[PDB]
Amino acid sequence: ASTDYWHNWTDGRGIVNAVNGPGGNYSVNWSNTGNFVVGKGWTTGSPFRTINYNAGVWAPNGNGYLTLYGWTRSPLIEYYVVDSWGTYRPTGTYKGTVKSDGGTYDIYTTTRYNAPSIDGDRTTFTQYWSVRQSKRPTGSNATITFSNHVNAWKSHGMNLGSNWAYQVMATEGYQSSGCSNVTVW
């Protein structure tokens, strides 16, 4: 599938060299960062989307996530399906687990306050996570059947908003260095 959206956000610290490659491809090299999110996907998320991706390079040197990433509005939800990471495995309020795409993911909720949201302002919102129990092998074709996560989330009272903002296979980093290369379709 053709991704139609390019996501490149940095808070401004350090170097975040994000390359908008051809079609579904992108790379990032980063060093001395603060927080940043780069990814390719779709302007409007769907709870029915099967995301295919191939991380040709996944080489964080510190804290970074290789992860499905998106938002909904009404209510405002920032959500993740984390397939891999660097030094730090993200967690939250454990809600249970879901098996999907040859992996088992833990489900968490967190809540952000005094934190910048999609609309560019500091506010309060809820994060939904599926985080794989162990790092997913990279380098081969992988899929994320998002509906598996949407459903299992639902089973735990975690409902997504009616209004769907973007949905990307992303590289996210926090105060770290490294590189990635990911192809999304």
- Cα separation of 153 and 137, whole Å? 24
Residue 99 is a catalytic residue: no
**Active-site hit among 27, 78, 101, 128:** 78
Q: What is the DSSP letter of 10?
A: E
User: Which amino acid appears at position 161 of this protein?
Assistant: G
**Active-site hit among 36, 172, 173, 181:** 172
Task: Answer whether 100's CB lies under 8 Å from 50's CB.
Answer: no
Residue 21 is a catalytic residue: no
Nearest residue to 100 via CA among 79, 126, 131: 131
State how far the alpha carbon of 36 is from the alpha carbons of 7, 33, 99, 100, 147, in Å. Answer: 10, 8, 29, 27, 26
- Cα separation of 134 and 84, whole Å? 8
Phi, psi of 152 (to 5 degrees): -55, -35
Q: Catalogue the active-site residues.
A: 78, 172
